[PDB]
Amino acid sequence: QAFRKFTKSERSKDLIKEAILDNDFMKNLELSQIQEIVDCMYPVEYGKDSCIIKEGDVGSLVYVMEDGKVEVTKEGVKLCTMGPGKVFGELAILYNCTQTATVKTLVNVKLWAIDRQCFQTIMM
Predict the structure, then answer these.
(1) Residues 107, 48 contacting (CB under 8 angstroms)
(2) Membrane-spanning residues where?
């Protein structure tokens, strides 16, 4: 039952909650689960032109964008761009499978990540 609270700003808590409630796979979580996810999220930064996750890789974190923009690609096609308040990486963890798409930064990016063990603890 791995878990750890990371102290963060009120704006960041609101951003994580908005991202959860905006995603069809996550938006029906109980309030207690939403808060546990908020608490277990920790900050990560990736410089511009950096792959966050690559298609075909095993999942390790669930990500919520905080600042900057990422491009999601598959088979060399831009699927979309993702800015603040968007979740990604949850499917690989929820369905214990590899990443369907690559996510690469277009500019310097800040995001919130939750370790798969903590996400698994909360979903249980």
Answers:
(1) yes
(2) none
Experimental method: X-ray
Domain count, the chain: 1
This structure's resolution (Å) is: 1.3
Q: Which domain holds residue 37?
A: 1-124
Which residue is it, tokens 């609270």? 5
Alpha-carbon distance of 43 to 111, in angstroms, equals 6
